[PDB]
Here is the input.
Amino acid sequence: GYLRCLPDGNLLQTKIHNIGATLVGVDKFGNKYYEKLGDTQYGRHRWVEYAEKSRYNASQVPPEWHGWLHFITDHTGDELLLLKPKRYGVEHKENLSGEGEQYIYHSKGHALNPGQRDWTRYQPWES
Amino acid sequence: FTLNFGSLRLVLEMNGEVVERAEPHIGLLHRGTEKLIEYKTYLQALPYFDRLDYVSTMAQEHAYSLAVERLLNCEVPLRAQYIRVLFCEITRILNHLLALTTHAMDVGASTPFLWAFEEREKLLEFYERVSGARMHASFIRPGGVAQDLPLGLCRDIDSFTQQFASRIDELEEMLTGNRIWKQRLVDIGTVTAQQAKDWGFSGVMLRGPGVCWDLRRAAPYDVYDQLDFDVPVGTRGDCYDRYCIRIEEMRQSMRIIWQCLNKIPSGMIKADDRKLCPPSRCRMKLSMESSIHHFELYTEGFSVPASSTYTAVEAPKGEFGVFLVSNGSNRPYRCKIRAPGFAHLQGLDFMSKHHMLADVVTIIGTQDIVFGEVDR
Amino acid sequence: TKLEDEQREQLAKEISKDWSSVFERSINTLFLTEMVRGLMLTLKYFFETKVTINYPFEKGPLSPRFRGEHALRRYPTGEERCIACKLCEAICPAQAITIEAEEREDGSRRTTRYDIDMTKCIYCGFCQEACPVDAIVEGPNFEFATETHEELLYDKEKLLENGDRWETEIAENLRSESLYR
Amino acid sequence: KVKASTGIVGLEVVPNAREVLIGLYSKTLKEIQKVPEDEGYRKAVESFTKHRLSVCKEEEDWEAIEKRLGCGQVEELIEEAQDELKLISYMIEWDPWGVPDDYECEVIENDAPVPKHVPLHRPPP
Amino acid sequence: TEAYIRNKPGMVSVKDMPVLQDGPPPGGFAPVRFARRIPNKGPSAVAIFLAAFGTFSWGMYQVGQGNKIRR
Amino acid sequence: SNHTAKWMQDTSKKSPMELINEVPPIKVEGRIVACEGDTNPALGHPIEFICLDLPEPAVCKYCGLRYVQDH
Amino acid sequence: KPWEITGPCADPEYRSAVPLATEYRLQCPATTKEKPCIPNSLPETVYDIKYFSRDQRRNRPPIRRTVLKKADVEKLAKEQTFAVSDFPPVYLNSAVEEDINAIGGGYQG
Amino acid sequence: VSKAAEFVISKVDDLMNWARRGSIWPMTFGLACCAVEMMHTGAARYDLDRFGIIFRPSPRQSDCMIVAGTLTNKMAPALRKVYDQMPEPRWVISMGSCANGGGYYHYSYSVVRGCDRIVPVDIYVPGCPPTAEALLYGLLQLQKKINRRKDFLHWWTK
Amino acid sequence: KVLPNSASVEEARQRVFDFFRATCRSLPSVMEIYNLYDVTSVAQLRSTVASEIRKNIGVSDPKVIDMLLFKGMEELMNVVNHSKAISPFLKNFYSSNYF
Amino acid sequence: DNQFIFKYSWETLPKKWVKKMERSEHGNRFDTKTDYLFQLLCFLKLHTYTRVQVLIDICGVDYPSRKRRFEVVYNLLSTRYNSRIRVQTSADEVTRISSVVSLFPSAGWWEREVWDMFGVSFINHPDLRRILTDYGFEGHPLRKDFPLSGYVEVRYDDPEKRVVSEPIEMTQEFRYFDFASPWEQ
Ligand code: SF4
Ligand code: SF4
Ligand code: SF4
Ligand SMILES: [Zn+2]
Here is the structure.
């Protein structure tokens, strides 16, 4: 995705920064994670290309690569995928929060919930 | 005529652009902090002190913990004392940087703001590595600290101290000696030592006149009596001398940080007794008594003996004091919060007398009024 | 003001000792030496490298002991890690946690209702350190801005799914910090 | 010599500091003569005022009187003397002397220890 | 128990328990130059004044020559 | 059942009760066990000692795992 | 470069603001090459637990109260006297006007 | 209503949304202790000027109000008065916990339980304080929210 | 300016009269402050103020009288600064249980 | 520490107004009558060997059990002799106590704050308007009997086009947890 650079200018900065970088990994969502040591300042030696140039979001980074990208861990996302728990767990989902009422989270008492639960803590006689 | 400005509300009486008098209205950030502290346990009330005087976070934690330990009589280990001093001086550096750069922006100088924010981002990274969050980190607790320092923090702080000596030289070169800066600062809002004592000034605003009195030397509440630092005083109290005092305080804070890094000991991070300090996770998961004490300390609190005390520390703004009155229960009966912005904002009235509007904003910047602590 | 006048005269006499000094001072005040020096420093920083983070692709450094989004974990077997000890809201300074519970079908003590207000949580980590079983943890996630307050009002199912989603990173941070405990 | 500056911005150096102090102390003694003798305030005032008057009479140089007194800043001493005059005038204006009879005062003394790391104002050397 | 938590493979007494915390490296770090060093290596006041005066004089001479050519 | 439906409404994934019933009982030789939650005692729950004289499996009451005596 | 003529840049002991990624923060906090060991108690107070001696919170003397009457007040007033050495000491301090490079040459910190 | 007029309308709406997204001019409402973190967001590291965010001190020229800090009963009328002066295309970002639901002073006199009771807020930024990273995430979320404004289509189909 | 506590009922009465004078003189300012000219009836407002003073006669402590006057002057300053047949039992019964 | 000028005061101060004294490591304490507080502070501020010339602060404590519920505390400091002192009195709701604005000019805002929080009025204050709470606040928030959440709350009323104040109707009532142990005494 290089034509998006002209109207994006931020992907342009990313592509400029991927000149001397080394592709340290890639996730199952397509995000390509790059590292670049040497003559680089501390804060800009690890980054991601989201592989979704049109509508890339900051919440698309999976938890497996979140720590490595945020400099919490030296462990890449592959090791955390290997260590992913079994018998339970859900796939990573972005922070939609506005893409639809059927997508966003609703409380059990909210009218938009598919199943709304009453809250009275007593059972009437119910003739 | 009366001119109104509207969280800083201020009404000024003007005659010829000359400020006859200035009256601030402050309650715009009142939040019932004292009432909530009375309604909550001591540990639950520590975040309130985190929020008070938010530019200087851990100074208020230090004051509150010192008051609680005074009312409680618990010995804090040397390592905990040294890390508390280190982070208090980091807090002082942060507050001085923010005060100086906001004052410079109010004057008109815009560029040092972002350099000092790069330095502040480094220091907030230090905070976030040592504790939970960059700001309002509930790290200092009665009896010690929350957790031990992560490894490498000392080396990173040393690197920061060197680069920050360079940065302070840099900022002083740009601001100090500028003709515009001098014309903005000198002979603006001068305070005599008698006036400062009458109006209850503290910290830089009190040492600016030259009273030659500092809390860290008058009542050393830490290893401060082993750190042989310097305390600058102003020859003729005004905005320029207060700014120079703040620069010198940043330098001496770096000095104290280096000394603490050099002579930090190896030991524990909190009070030895589990009746007052929570046990570790392994201890509470392995030991029956430790589980009991963790449960009791996290449902109830430590019951301080019924007494009333006033504990004051040298916060970067000035003397920050907490007046704690207890009744033997797990909650503080009364907690009065003397912030070194409440008195300075009173001093605004006579400081910005016969001055102009730009002198008023310069005086506000010099006093460095954070409205959270004045609306405590 | 007579004292001020005589002090000014004394200072003027002091800093006008000789023609060399007065000429140097006049030239310095006339040719804007300090202004030129400030301009030179400004140009140096114009030509030096920048520290901008390039937000969406490059993100600021964090720590394993980061207080981000409240979340609930599970045991490796799959059962809820949270017993209903109610130490969360006993210590929560902002009272942002509400919990109700009853005995489960197999006699286990489990919470039948567990909600946290993210508009009332002060993100202080008191619950995550008061948990006897490491059930509630303040996860590393912090980019969960919502368009609605009702969305920001969490509950047990959302906390559990957050824990399941962020289980691996939360586990890594928990190991690293249980070392520091 | 002459003091270039007193450090305190509010205070200003006075050339005739010794003469001003002598006059203020003499007036202090003359005014405190009106206070009842039984009161401890009068005894303390006479004590320190006589001591200061004696030392400032014996020593001529202000540096010498400062060094011998140990308080320093003859300007601060003059301010203290003026405040003492004001206080004596106030205690003549209102009469606080004498116990009111059938009087009780509750002296409270607790020896509860405090840790060495709390802020306690250390005594001057 | 502290001994149980910090047990050593071959320790006999509760003392000499293993310990490793953040601290100085052997040597105690390096000095950090708390003071300020501002060198004034710029041109002297007399030098810049002479340069300005000579520049003004030679420039006025050049102005005269150019005006003569234009005339 | 009722409790699970009361705190959860997804009714599509497996509830923790079903998973913990599906994990088999743990056979142990001794009469008493030490239940810690996982391989790391510091990352599990407070230690729980369980008596195994009754023939039926005994729930740990923490991370309930149903330890059963061998013979 | 024009900025080395004068100012902080001309100083040989000048430090750049930007820290290199290869020298600032070598090991991420969650992955440290060495395992920590933080003490939580003195070695003495491990197998010798005894809290009634180190109970610093409750081991305090009781508060003492004394009701002084007029006779006692007069007795103390007559007994007491003031001397030149019994007056409170003054906490005196003064400026020195000392150079910035005077303490350790400006390096030691 | 057609398929070519619909395409033209979609292009016009895309251009309008691009302009409004790239030229956001928020105004700080900086009370309490989210304003310091906001200034950190506006600093060199997480710079806001790149995305078009510049802080306009005058409410008449501002686009969206970012309320960061605690809302007090003494200050809520001022907040509402300042909000009412903003132009009709307007948005609100409630930063922190105090401005969302009262935060750490929810059970307190003279504290508004979130700015939602005074002004209609569009996006909440949870945190206390939210990291500058998170606040810039919230601003990008505002850009995404105003990236789906079919104003021209709605005007056409009335 | 705040004054010491009144030591006499006559002094308290004089202070009450002074406060009522202040209210009466400050009444026309409230007219332009609030703008309810349709049904204000300035005379009715004066009557209501007098009725409040007359319903506060059961107090006899001069300290309480002075405190009430202080709070009334505070309220006056606030208002100047513009800061705002089925029997009774059956209606409450039909409304709610808590009455 | 530094109990020098405290003992010197008790030696030199007139005994008429010293109702009680406390010698503590938490702070030396003087408790007097409200009639003589101004004179006592004038003596301390002006005397040459007890120069507490800076007023740290003025605080209020509520004691519903006592006849005079309010306790007005004055924390003062002596920088010349480097020691802190405490002088307190007892006042009730109606009685007015003397003001020390003339002695310490900083006392004005703390006295206004005490008025705001408790209701203790002062005799010689140049002004005594509320400082911290909302305009038109009715109660005194720091009194023990005052509810934590207050009596009224504000919201935006669209028909009125203004922020109106209405009686509190808050959801998620404050949950008071009784953690007190019966063996703490
Ligand atoms: S992090 Fe603090 S405020 Fe948030 S839920 Fe936990 S205890 Fe409550
Ligand atoms: S402290 Fe842990 S086990 Fe207890 S209620 Fe909270 S999450 Fe559950
Ligand atoms: S939400 Fe937290 S950080 Fe923000 S203003 Fe409130 S207390 Fe401060
Ligand atoms: Zn178990």
